[PDB]
Amino acid sequence: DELYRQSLEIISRYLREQATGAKDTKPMGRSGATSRKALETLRRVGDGVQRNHETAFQGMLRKLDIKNEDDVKSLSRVMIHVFSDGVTNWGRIVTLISFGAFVAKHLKTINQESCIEPLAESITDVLVRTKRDWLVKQRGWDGFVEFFHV
Ligand SMILES: COCCn1c(C(=O)O)cc2cc(C)cc(N3C[C@@H](C)n4c(c(CCCOc5cc(C)c(Cl)c(C)c5)c5ccc(Cl)c(-c6c(C)nn(C)c6C)c54)C3=O)c21
């Protein structure tokens, strides 16, 4: 319903902005405040996650050997495997998206900007499908911004 659309808007905006390598502060949609604040939080926490896990991110990127949109279509399986284990929390969700931004920068490097939208959708699809009930219990992105945004 609303949860998918809002998630996709947040994730797509962050991956896109990360790939161009400058912030975009165009406002969001109707639920403008929450989505804006979630995006600001992703910039802060997400950028730190990428720095912290530079090595593992780099090693994993290399093993994924991404070239084109067909590869992008084939990322979902490893993504699901690595994320749908065990504990759910917002830090883990930021880690999933942060790895998404890391790949999106690579896609830019190899002139595969067309793939960034499919990537974001694939991330959103996995997030909302596997964690729907938990996300609803937290009041979704409101729960994220309420407690994590500074
Ligand atoms: C130890 O953690 C087990 C899993 N886990 C549990 C739990 O209970 O299982 C709780 C918990 C809490 C947090 C905050 C984080 C983790 N992690 C820590 C590690 C295991 N991770 C996690 C993620 C996020 C989920 C997948 O995102 C993806 C996103 C995209 C766009 C693609 Cl295309 C793909 C293929 C994957 C990682 C992403 C990349 C790497 Cl490179 C590592 C990564 C790092 C870093 N080091 N190494 C060796 C790898 C392989 C990742 C994760 O969710 C947690």
Side-chain angles (χ1 to χ4, degrees), residues 10 13-18 22-28 35-51 94 97-98 101 105 144 149:
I10 289 162
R13 282 277 301 253
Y14 184 57
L15 270 49
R16 193 150 70 233
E17 154 196 303
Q18 288 272 300
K23 287 174 207 143
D24 180 14
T25 67
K26 160 194 52 172
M28 295 290 177
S35 298
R36 180 180 46 73
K37 291 196 195 201
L39 180 62
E40 291 166 6
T41 297
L42 275 175
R43 287 177 191 131
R44 170 170 63 74
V45 175
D47 299 13
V49 173
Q50 291 172 75
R51 296 191 290 288
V94 170
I97 299 164
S98 297
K105 293 166 187 191
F144 178 77
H149 175 260

PDB file of all heavy atoms in Angstrom, residues 10 13-18 22-28 35-51 94 97-98 101 105 144 149:
ATOM      1  N   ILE A  10      12.195   6.610  -0.722  1.00  0.00           N
ATOM      2  CA  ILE A  10      13.349   6.851   0.126  1.00  0.00           C
ATOM      3  C   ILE A  10      14.587   6.164  -0.452  1.00  0.00           C
ATOM      4  O   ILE A  10      15.654   6.770  -0.536  1.00  0.00           O
ATOM      5  CB  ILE A  10      13.092   6.371   1.573  1.00  0.00           C
ATOM      6  CG1 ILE A  10      12.082   7.280   2.309  1.00  0.00           C
ATOM      7  CG2 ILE A  10      14.395   6.296   2.373  1.00  0.00           C
ATOM      8  CD1 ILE A  10      11.488   6.611   3.529  1.00  0.00           C
ATOM      9  N   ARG A  13      15.790   7.533  -3.963  1.00  0.00           N
ATOM     10  CA  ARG A  13      16.423   8.847  -3.833  1.00  0.00           C
ATOM     11  C   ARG A  13      17.852   8.701  -3.292  1.00  0.00           C
ATOM     12  O   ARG A  13      18.784   9.281  -3.848  1.00  0.00           O
ATOM     13  CB  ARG A  13      15.644   9.826  -2.938  1.00  0.00           C
ATOM     14  CG  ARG A  13      14.431  10.496  -3.563  1.00  0.00           C
ATOM     15  CD  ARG A  13      14.692  11.764  -4.445  1.00  0.00           C
ATOM     16  NE  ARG A  13      15.359  12.833  -3.688  1.00  0.00           N
ATOM     17  CZ  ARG A  13      14.752  13.942  -3.290  1.00  0.00           C
ATOM     18  NH1 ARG A  13      13.476  14.137  -3.591  1.00  0.00           N
ATOM     19  NH2 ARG A  13      15.407  14.848  -2.595  1.00  0.00           N
ATOM     20  N   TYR A  14      18.045   7.927  -2.206  1.00  0.00           N
ATOM     21  CA  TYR A  14      19.395   7.786  -1.639  1.00  0.00           C
ATOM     22  C   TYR A  14      20.374   7.127  -2.626  1.00  0.00           C
ATOM     23  O   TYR A  14      21.447   7.643  -2.843  1.00  0.00           O
ATOM     24  CB  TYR A  14      19.294   6.922  -0.396  1.00  0.00           C
ATOM     25  CG  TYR A  14      20.597   6.759   0.362  1.00  0.00           C
ATOM     26  CD1 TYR A  14      21.290   7.872   0.831  1.00  0.00           C
ATOM     27  CD2 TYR A  14      21.150   5.489   0.579  1.00  0.00           C
ATOM     28  CE1 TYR A  14      22.483   7.729   1.535  1.00  0.00           C
ATOM     29  CE2 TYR A  14      22.312   5.332   1.309  1.00  0.00           C
ATOM     30  CZ  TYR A  14      22.989   6.461   1.755  1.00  0.00           C
ATOM     31  OH  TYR A  14      24.152   6.327   2.449  1.00  0.00           O
ATOM     32  N   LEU A  15      20.018   6.005  -3.252  1.00  0.00           N
ATOM     33  CA  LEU A  15      20.908   5.344  -4.205  1.00  0.00           C
ATOM     34  C   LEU A  15      21.275   6.293  -5.364  1.00  0.00           C
ATOM     35  O   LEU A  15      22.431   6.361  -5.771  1.00  0.00           O
ATOM     36  CB  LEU A  15      20.302   4.032  -4.735  1.00  0.00           C
ATOM     37  CG  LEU A  15      20.624   2.756  -3.959  1.00  0.00           C
ATOM     38  CD1 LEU A  15      20.408   2.839  -2.439  1.00  0.00           C
ATOM     39  CD2 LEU A  15      19.858   1.568  -4.538  1.00  0.00           C
ATOM     40  N   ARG A  16      20.291   7.041  -5.881  1.00  0.00           N
ATOM     41  CA  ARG A  16      20.509   7.933  -7.005  1.00  0.00           C
ATOM     42  C   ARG A  16      21.498   9.020  -6.602  1.00  0.00           C
ATOM     43  O   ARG A  16      22.460   9.303  -7.306  1.00  0.00           O
ATOM     44  CB  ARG A  16      19.150   8.535  -7.397  1.00  0.00           C
ATOM     45  CG  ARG A  16      19.067   9.262  -8.735  1.00  0.00           C
ATOM     46  CD  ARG A  16      17.690   9.176  -9.382  1.00  0.00           C
ATOM     47  NE  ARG A  16      16.785   9.990  -8.569  1.00  0.00           N
ATOM     48  CZ  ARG A  16      15.627   9.643  -8.024  1.00  0.00           C
ATOM     49  NH1 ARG A  16      15.168   8.397  -8.142  1.00  0.00           N
ATOM     50  NH2 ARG A  16      14.947  10.582  -7.367  1.00  0.00           N
ATOM     51  N   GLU A  17      21.222   9.658  -5.459  1.00  0.00           N
ATOM     52  CA  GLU A  17      22.050  10.755  -4.989  1.00  0.00           C
ATOM     53  C   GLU A  17      23.453  10.231  -4.706  1.00  0.00           C
ATOM     54  O   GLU A  17      24.432  10.915  -4.994  1.00  0.00           O
ATOM     55  CB  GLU A  17      21.226  11.355  -3.847  1.00  0.00           C
ATOM     56  CG  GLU A  17      22.008  12.069  -2.776  1.00  0.00           C
ATOM     57  CD  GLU A  17      21.166  12.280  -1.540  1.00  0.00           C
ATOM     58  OE1 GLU A  17      20.112  12.893  -1.693  1.00  0.00           O
ATOM     59  OE2 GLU A  17      21.639  11.893  -0.442  1.00  0.00           O
ATOM     60  N   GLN A  18      23.549   9.031  -4.134  1.00  0.00           N
ATOM     61  CA  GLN A  18      24.852   8.483  -3.823  1.00  0.00           C
ATOM     62  C   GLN A  18      25.601   8.281  -5.135  1.00  0.00           C
ATOM     63  O   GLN A  18      26.791   8.550  -5.201  1.00  0.00           O
ATOM     64  CB  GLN A  18      24.713   7.214  -2.969  1.00  0.00           C
ATOM     65  CG  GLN A  18      24.281   7.506  -1.535  1.00  0.00           C
ATOM     66  CD  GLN A  18      25.465   7.778  -0.636  1.00  0.00           C
ATOM     67  OE1 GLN A  18      26.346   6.925  -0.462  1.00  0.00           O
ATOM     68  NE2 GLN A  18      25.515   8.975  -0.068  1.00  0.00           N
ATOM     69  N   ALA A  22      26.519  13.892  -5.254  1.00  0.00           N
ATOM     70  CA  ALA A  22      26.077  15.095  -4.562  1.00  0.00           C
ATOM     71  C   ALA A  22      24.630  14.946  -4.087  1.00  0.00           C
ATOM     72  O   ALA A  22      23.796  14.356  -4.783  1.00  0.00           O
ATOM     73  CB  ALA A  22      26.216  16.323  -5.449  1.00  0.00           C
ATOM     74  N   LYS A  23      24.332  15.535  -2.914  1.00  0.00           N
ATOM     75  CA  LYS A  23      23.004  15.506  -2.305  1.00  0.00           C
ATOM     76  C   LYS A  23      21.969  16.127  -3.248  1.00  0.00           C
ATOM     77  O   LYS A  23      22.287  17.047  -3.994  1.00  0.00           O
ATOM     78  CB  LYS A  23      22.896  16.438  -1.094  1.00  0.00           C
ATOM     79  CG  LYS A  23      23.524  16.179   0.267  1.00  0.00           C
ATOM     80  CD  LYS A  23      23.291  17.444   1.101  1.00  0.00           C
ATOM     81  CE  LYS A  23      24.283  17.752   2.205  1.00  0.00           C
ATOM     82  NZ  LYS A  23      24.555  19.189   2.360  1.00  0.00           N
ATOM     83  N   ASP A  24      20.721  15.649  -3.148  1.00  0.00           N
ATOM     84  CA  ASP A  24      19.545  16.229  -3.764  1.00  0.00           C
ATOM     85  C   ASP A  24      18.536  16.550  -2.651  1.00  0.00           C
ATOM     86  O   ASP A  24      18.071  15.633  -1.954  1.00  0.00           O
ATOM     87  CB  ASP A  24      18.993  15.235  -4.775  1.00  0.00           C
ATOM     88  CG  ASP A  24      17.742  15.669  -5.523  1.00  0.00           C
ATOM     89  OD1 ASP A  24      17.419  16.867  -5.462  1.00  0.00           O
ATOM     90  OD2 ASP A  24      17.098  14.803  -6.156  1.00  0.00           O
ATOM     91  N   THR A  25      18.220  17.847  -2.468  1.00  0.00           N
ATOM     92  CA  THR A  25      17.288  18.228  -1.411  1.00  0.00           C
ATOM     93  C   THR A  25      15.962  18.748  -1.961  1.00  0.00           C
ATOM     94  O   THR A  25      15.243  19.443  -1.250  1.00  0.00           O
ATOM     95  CB  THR A  25      17.897  19.168  -0.371  1.00  0.00           C
ATOM     96  OG1 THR A  25      18.155  20.386  -1.065  1.00  0.00           O
ATOM     97  CG2 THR A  25      19.109  18.570   0.328  1.00  0.00           C
ATOM     98  N   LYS A  26      15.626  18.389  -3.203  1.00  0.00           N
ATOM     99  CA  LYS A  26      14.251  18.517  -3.658  1.00  0.00           C
ATOM    100  C   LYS A  26      13.332  17.811  -2.657  1.00  0.00           C
ATOM    101  O   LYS A  26      13.620  16.702  -2.207  1.00  0.00           O
ATOM    102  CB  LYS A  26      14.145  17.977  -5.089  1.00  0.00           C
ATOM    103  CG  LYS A  26      12.748  17.592  -5.584  1.00  0.00           C
ATOM    104  CD  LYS A  26      12.736  16.762  -6.866  1.00  0.00           C
ATOM    105  CE  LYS A  26      13.618  15.544  -6.805  1.00  0.00           C
ATOM    106  NZ  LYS A  26      13.454  14.650  -7.955  1.00  0.00           N
ATOM    107  N   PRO A  27      12.198  18.430  -2.260  1.00  0.00           N
ATOM    108  CA  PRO A  27      11.299  17.812  -1.279  1.00  0.00           C
ATOM    109  C   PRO A  27      10.619  16.574  -1.866  1.00  0.00           C
ATOM    110  O   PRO A  27      10.698  16.330  -3.065  1.00  0.00           O
ATOM    111  CB  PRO A  27      10.320  18.958  -0.931  1.00  0.00           C
ATOM    112  CG  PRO A  27      10.327  19.829  -2.169  1.00  0.00           C
ATOM    113  CD  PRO A  27      11.740  19.749  -2.729  1.00  0.00           C
ATOM    114  N   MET A  28       9.885  15.836  -1.032  1.00  0.00           N
ATOM    115  CA  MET A  28       9.517  14.461  -1.322  1.00  0.00           C
ATOM    116  C   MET A  28       8.140  14.338  -1.986  1.00  0.00           C
ATOM    117  O   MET A  28       8.019  14.595  -3.182  1.00  0.00           O
ATOM    118  CB  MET A  28       9.667  13.634  -0.043  1.00  0.00           C
ATOM    119  CG  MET A  28      11.102  13.539   0.449  1.00  0.00           C
ATOM    120  SD  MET A  28      12.205  12.544  -0.584  1.00  0.00           S
ATOM    121  CE  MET A  28      13.725  12.806   0.325  1.00  0.00           C
ATOM    122  N   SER A  35       9.571  11.233   4.892  1.00  0.00           N
ATOM    123  CA  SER A  35      10.475  10.757   3.845  1.00  0.00           C
ATOM    124  C   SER A  35      11.759  11.600   3.794  1.00  0.00           C
ATOM    125  O   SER A  35      12.850  11.048   3.596  1.00  0.00           O
ATOM    126  CB  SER A  35       9.798  10.683   2.496  1.00  0.00           C
ATOM    127  OG  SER A  35       8.720   9.764   2.557  1.00  0.00           O
ATOM    128  N   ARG A  36      11.611  12.931   3.955  1.00  0.00           N
ATOM    129  CA  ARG A  36      12.753  13.838   4.045  1.00  0.00           C
ATOM    130  C   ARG A  36      13.659  13.453   5.217  1.00  0.00           C
ATOM    131  O   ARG A  36      14.889  13.347   5.077  1.00  0.00           O
ATOM    132  CB  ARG A  36      12.289  15.291   4.167  1.00  0.00           C
ATOM    133  CG  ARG A  36      13.437  16.297   4.264  1.00  0.00           C
ATOM    134  CD  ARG A  36      12.968  17.764   4.399  1.00  0.00           C
ATOM    135  NE  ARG A  36      11.889  17.991   5.376  1.00  0.00           N
ATOM    136  CZ  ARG A  36      12.092  17.948   6.696  1.00  0.00           C
ATOM    137  NH1 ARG A  36      13.334  17.930   7.159  1.00  0.00           N
ATOM    138  NH2 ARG A  36      11.063  17.958   7.535  1.00  0.00           N
ATOM    139  N   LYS A  37      13.042  13.215   6.372  1.00  0.00           N
ATOM    140  CA  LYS A  37      13.841  12.932   7.552  1.00  0.00           C
ATOM    141  C   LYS A  37      14.512  11.567   7.448  1.00  0.00           C
ATOM    142  O   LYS A  37      15.659  11.442   7.864  1.00  0.00           O
ATOM    143  CB  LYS A  37      13.028  13.093   8.840  1.00  0.00           C
ATOM    144  CG  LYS A  37      12.651  14.527   9.153  1.00  0.00           C
ATOM    145  CD  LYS A  37      12.207  14.622  10.611  1.00  0.00           C
ATOM    146  CE  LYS A  37      11.489  15.867  10.999  1.00  0.00           C
ATOM    147  NZ  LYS A  37      11.578  16.016  12.459  1.00  0.00           N
ATOM    148  N   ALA A  38      13.824  10.576   6.861  1.00  0.00           N
ATOM    149  CA  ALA A  38      14.413   9.260   6.634  1.00  0.00           C
ATOM    150  C   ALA A  38      15.616   9.369   5.704  1.00  0.00           C
ATOM    151  O   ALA A  38      16.623   8.712   5.947  1.00  0.00           O
ATOM    152  CB  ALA A  38      13.374   8.292   6.074  1.00  0.00           C
ATOM    153  N   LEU A  39      15.504  10.202   4.659  1.00  0.00           N
ATOM    154  CA  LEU A  39      16.583  10.416   3.704  1.00  0.00           C
ATOM    155  C   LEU A  39      17.772  11.101   4.367  1.00  0.00           C
ATOM    156  O   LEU A  39      18.916  10.776   4.080  1.00  0.00           O
ATOM    157  CB  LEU A  39      16.093  11.158   2.457  1.00  0.00           C
ATOM    158  CG  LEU A  39      17.154  11.453   1.371  1.00  0.00           C
ATOM    159  CD1 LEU A  39      17.834  10.235   0.721  1.00  0.00           C
ATOM    160  CD2 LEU A  39      16.627  12.406   0.281  1.00  0.00           C
ATOM    161  N   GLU A  40      17.504  12.079   5.237  1.00  0.00           N
ATOM    162  CA  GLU A  40      18.576  12.740   5.983  1.00  0.00           C
ATOM    163  C   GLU A  40      19.280  11.738   6.885  1.00  0.00           C
ATOM    164  O   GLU A  40      20.498  11.818   7.047  1.00  0.00           O
ATOM    165  CB  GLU A  40      18.092  13.947   6.796  1.00  0.00           C
ATOM    166  CG  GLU A  40      17.673  15.120   5.910  1.00  0.00           C
ATOM    167  CD  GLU A  40      16.868  16.235   6.563  1.00  0.00           C
ATOM    168  OE1 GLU A  40      16.663  16.229   7.807  1.00  0.00           O
ATOM    169  OE2 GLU A  40      16.420  17.126   5.794  1.00  0.00           O
ATOM    170  N   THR A  41      18.502  10.814   7.475  1.00  0.00           N
ATOM    171  CA  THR A  41      19.059   9.818   8.388  1.00  0.00           C
ATOM    172  C   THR A  41      19.930   8.840   7.607  1.00  0.00           C
ATOM    173  O   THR A  41      21.010   8.480   8.072  1.00  0.00           O
ATOM    174  CB  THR A  41      17.987   9.107   9.220  1.00  0.00           C
ATOM    175  OG1 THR A  41      17.362  10.099  10.022  1.00  0.00           O
ATOM    176  CG2 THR A  41      18.565   8.205  10.293  1.00  0.00           C
ATOM    177  N   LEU A  42      19.460   8.407   6.424  1.00  0.00           N
ATOM    178  CA  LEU A  42      20.235   7.524   5.566  1.00  0.00           C
ATOM    179  C   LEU A  42      21.561   8.166   5.180  1.00  0.00           C
ATOM    180  O   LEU A  42      22.571   7.486   5.132  1.00  0.00           O
ATOM    181  CB  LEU A  42      19.466   7.133   4.294  1.00  0.00           C
ATOM    182  CG  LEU A  42      18.515   5.952   4.411  1.00  0.00           C
ATOM    183  CD1 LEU A  42      17.758   5.794   3.088  1.00  0.00           C
ATOM    184  CD2 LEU A  42      19.347   4.700   4.724  1.00  0.00           C
ATOM    185  N   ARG A  43      21.545   9.451   4.845  1.00  0.00           N
ATOM    186  CA  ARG A  43      22.783  10.158   4.538  1.00  0.00           C
ATOM    187  C   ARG A  43      23.768  10.034   5.700  1.00  0.00           C
ATOM    188  O   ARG A  43      24.915   9.654   5.499  1.00  0.00           O
ATOM    189  CB  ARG A  43      22.560  11.639   4.209  1.00  0.00           C
ATOM    190  CG  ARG A  43      21.921  11.823   2.844  1.00  0.00           C
ATOM    191  CD  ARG A  43      21.682  13.313   2.656  1.00  0.00           C
ATOM    192  NE  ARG A  43      20.830  13.615   1.503  1.00  0.00           N
ATOM    193  CZ  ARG A  43      19.791  14.410   1.509  1.00  0.00           C
ATOM    194  NH1 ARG A  43      19.485  15.051   2.613  1.00  0.00           N
ATOM    195  NH2 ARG A  43      19.090  14.575   0.401  1.00  0.00           N
ATOM    196  N   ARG A  44      23.306  10.338   6.917  1.00  0.00           N
ATOM    197  CA  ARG A  44      24.171  10.289   8.089  1.00  0.00           C
ATOM    198  C   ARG A  44      24.613   8.851   8.388  1.00  0.00           C
ATOM    199  O   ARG A  44      25.801   8.559   8.337  1.00  0.00           O
ATOM    200  CB  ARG A  44      23.468  11.045   9.215  1.00  0.00           C
ATOM    201  CG  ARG A  44      24.162  10.864  10.560  1.00  0.00           C
ATOM    202  CD  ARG A  44      23.662  11.769  11.643  1.00  0.00           C
ATOM    203  NE  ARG A  44      22.258  11.502  11.937  1.00  0.00           N
ATOM    204  CZ  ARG A  44      21.733  10.483  12.590  1.00  0.00           C
ATOM    205  NH1 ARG A  44      22.507   9.551  13.114  1.00  0.00           N
ATOM    206  NH2 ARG A  44      20.416  10.409  12.679  1.00  0.00           N
ATOM    207  N   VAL A  45      23.667   7.944   8.698  1.00  0.00           N
ATOM    208  CA  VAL A  45      23.979   6.602   9.186  1.00  0.00           C
ATOM    209  C   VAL A  45      24.554   5.753   8.050  1.00  0.00           C
ATOM    210  O   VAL A  45      25.545   5.049   8.260  1.00  0.00           O
ATOM    211  CB  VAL A  45      22.743   5.913   9.813  1.00  0.00           C
ATOM    212  CG1 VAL A  45      23.004   4.465  10.221  1.00  0.00           C
ATOM    213  CG2 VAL A  45      22.174   6.714  10.988  1.00  0.00           C
ATOM    214  N   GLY A  46      23.925   5.837   6.859  1.00  0.00           N
ATOM    215  CA  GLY A  46      24.300   5.089   5.663  1.00  0.00           C
ATOM    216  C   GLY A  46      25.730   5.391   5.217  1.00  0.00           C
ATOM    217  O   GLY A  46      26.478   4.474   4.845  1.00  0.00           O
ATOM    218  N   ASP A  47      26.110   6.677   5.254  1.00  0.00           N
ATOM    219  CA  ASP A  47      27.462   7.040   4.832  1.00  0.00           C
ATOM    220  C   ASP A  47      28.503   6.447   5.805  1.00  0.00           C
ATOM    221  O   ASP A  47      29.581   6.008   5.387  1.00  0.00           O
ATOM    222  CB  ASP A  47      27.594   8.537   4.572  1.00  0.00           C
ATOM    223  CG  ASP A  47      26.706   9.129   3.476  1.00  0.00           C
ATOM    224  OD1 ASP A  47      25.766   8.438   3.025  1.00  0.00           O
ATOM    225  OD2 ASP A  47      26.936  10.306   3.087  1.00  0.00           O
ATOM    226  N   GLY A  48      28.157   6.401   7.105  1.00  0.00           N
ATOM    227  CA  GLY A  48      29.041   5.845   8.108  1.00  0.00           C
ATOM    228  C   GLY A  48      29.197   4.336   7.940  1.00  0.00           C
ATOM    229  O   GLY A  48      30.295   3.783   8.066  1.00  0.00           O
ATOM    230  N   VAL A  49      28.066   3.668   7.663  1.00  0.00           N
ATOM    231  CA  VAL A  49      28.066   2.231   7.452  1.00  0.00           C
ATOM    232  C   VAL A  49      29.015   1.906   6.297  1.00  0.00           C
ATOM    233  O   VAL A  49      29.781   0.948   6.395  1.00  0.00           O
ATOM    234  CB  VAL A  49      26.629   1.704   7.207  1.00  0.00           C
ATOM    235  CG1 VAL A  49      26.576   0.227   6.808  1.00  0.00           C
ATOM    236  CG2 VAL A  49      25.667   1.991   8.370  1.00  0.00           C
ATOM    237  N   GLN A  50      28.974   2.697   5.202  1.00  0.00           N
ATOM    238  CA  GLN A  50      29.801   2.398   4.030  1.00  0.00           C
ATOM    239  C   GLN A  50      31.278   2.515   4.394  1.00  0.00           C
ATOM    240  O   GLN A  50      32.067   1.647   4.006  1.00  0.00           O
ATOM    241  CB  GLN A  50      29.476   3.201   2.762  1.00  0.00           C
ATOM    242  CG  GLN A  50      28.119   2.804   2.153  1.00  0.00           C
ATOM    243  CD  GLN A  50      27.678   3.705   1.027  1.00  0.00           C
ATOM    244  OE1 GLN A  50      28.201   3.624  -0.086  1.00  0.00           O
ATOM    245  NE2 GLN A  50      26.711   4.561   1.324  1.00  0.00           N
ATOM    246  N   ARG A  51      31.621   3.563   5.163  1.00  0.00           N
ATOM    247  CA  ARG A  51      32.992   3.767   5.633  1.00  0.00           C
ATOM    248  C   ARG A  51      33.412   2.592   6.514  1.00  0.00           C
ATOM    249  O   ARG A  51      34.439   1.956   6.259  1.00  0.00           O
ATOM    250  CB  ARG A  51      33.208   5.095   6.364  1.00  0.00           C
ATOM    251  CG  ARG A  51      33.015   6.358   5.540  1.00  0.00           C
ATOM    252  CD  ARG A  51      33.511   7.612   6.251  1.00  0.00           C
ATOM    253  NE  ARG A  51      32.699   8.027   7.406  1.00  0.00           N
ATOM    254  CZ  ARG A  51      31.476   8.574   7.436  1.00  0.00           C
ATOM    255  NH1 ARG A  51      30.888   8.997   6.336  1.00  0.00           N
ATOM    256  NH2 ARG A  51      30.851   8.720   8.592  1.00  0.00           N
ATOM    257  N   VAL A  94      19.268  -0.336   7.540  1.00  0.00           N
ATOM    258  CA  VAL A  94      20.183   0.660   6.994  1.00  0.00           C
ATOM    259  C   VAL A  94      21.361  -0.032   6.298  1.00  0.00           C
ATOM    260  O   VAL A  94      21.771   0.442   5.231  1.00  0.00           O
ATOM    261  CB  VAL A  94      20.620   1.716   8.023  1.00  0.00           C
ATOM    262  CG1 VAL A  94      21.756   2.593   7.510  1.00  0.00           C
ATOM    263  CG2 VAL A  94      19.437   2.588   8.414  1.00  0.00           C
ATOM    264  N   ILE A  97      20.385  -1.088   2.786  1.00  0.00           N
ATOM    265  CA  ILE A  97      20.268   0.056   1.879  1.00  0.00           C
ATOM    266  C   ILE A  97      21.651   0.634   1.570  1.00  0.00           C
ATOM    267  O   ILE A  97      21.893   1.092   0.452  1.00  0.00           O
ATOM    268  CB  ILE A  97      19.302   1.123   2.433  1.00  0.00           C
ATOM    269  CG1 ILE A  97      17.861   0.544   2.607  1.00  0.00           C
ATOM    270  CG2 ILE A  97      19.353   2.404   1.569  1.00  0.00           C
ATOM    271  CD1 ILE A  97      16.928   1.362   3.492  1.00  0.00           C
ATOM    272  N   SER A  98      22.543   0.631   2.569  1.00  0.00           N
ATOM    273  CA  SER A  98      23.877   1.194   2.452  1.00  0.00           C
ATOM    274  C   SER A  98      24.682   0.369   1.462  1.00  0.00           C
ATOM    275  O   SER A  98      25.442   0.919   0.667  1.00  0.00           O
ATOM    276  CB  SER A  98      24.593   1.216   3.788  1.00  0.00           C
ATOM    277  OG  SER A  98      23.919   2.040   4.725  1.00  0.00           O
ATOM    278  N   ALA A 101      23.565   1.494  -1.873  1.00  0.00           N
ATOM    279  CA  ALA A 101      24.235   2.710  -2.351  1.00  0.00           C
ATOM    280  C   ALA A 101      25.632   2.395  -2.869  1.00  0.00           C
ATOM    281  O   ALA A 101      26.087   2.958  -3.863  1.00  0.00           O
ATOM    282  CB  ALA A 101      24.263   3.789  -1.289  1.00  0.00           C
ATOM    283  N   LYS A 105      26.906   3.239  -6.707  1.00  0.00           N
ATOM    284  CA  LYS A 105      28.103   3.958  -7.113  1.00  0.00           C
ATOM    285  C   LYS A 105      28.880   3.156  -8.150  1.00  0.00           C
ATOM    286  O   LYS A 105      29.374   3.711  -9.139  1.00  0.00           O
ATOM    287  CB  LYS A 105      29.005   4.309  -5.926  1.00  0.00           C
ATOM    288  CG  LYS A 105      28.429   5.322  -4.944  1.00  0.00           C
ATOM    289  CD  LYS A 105      29.260   5.321  -3.664  1.00  0.00           C
ATOM    290  CE  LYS A 105      28.665   6.163  -2.608  1.00  0.00           C
ATOM    291  NZ  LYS A 105      29.597   6.371  -1.489  1.00  0.00           N
ATOM    292  N   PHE A 144      11.150   4.845  12.223  1.00  0.00           N
ATOM    293  CA  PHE A 144      12.565   5.067  11.926  1.00  0.00           C
ATOM    294  C   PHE A 144      12.958   6.520  12.249  1.00  0.00           C
ATOM    295  O   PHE A 144      13.915   6.788  12.977  1.00  0.00           O
ATOM    296  CB  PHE A 144      12.874   4.696  10.468  1.00  0.00           C
ATOM    297  CG  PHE A 144      14.309   4.939  10.028  1.00  0.00           C
ATOM    298  CD1 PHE A 144      15.342   4.070  10.385  1.00  0.00           C
ATOM    299  CD2 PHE A 144      14.616   6.032   9.245  1.00  0.00           C
ATOM    300  CE1 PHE A 144      16.647   4.312   9.964  1.00  0.00           C
ATOM    301  CE2 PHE A 144      15.910   6.259   8.809  1.00  0.00           C
ATOM    302  CZ  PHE A 144      16.924   5.400   9.162  1.00  0.00           C
ATOM    303  N   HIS A 149      16.529   9.684  13.690  1.00  0.00           N
ATOM    304  CA  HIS A 149      16.854  10.956  13.067  1.00  0.00           C
ATOM    305  C   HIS A 149      17.220  11.982  14.131  1.00  0.00           C
ATOM    306  O   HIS A 149      16.472  12.182  15.097  1.00  0.00           O
ATOM    307  CB  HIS A 149      15.631  11.512  12.320  1.00  0.00           C
ATOM    308  CG  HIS A 149      15.806  12.884  11.740  1.00  0.00           C
ATOM    309  ND1 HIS A 149      15.321  14.017  12.363  1.00  0.00           N
ATOM    310  CD2 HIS A 149      16.375  13.305  10.578  1.00  0.00           C
ATOM    311  CE1 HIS A 149      15.603  15.073  11.598  1.00  0.00           C
ATOM    312  NE2 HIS A 149      16.236  14.658  10.508  1.00  0.00           N
TER     313      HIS A 149
END
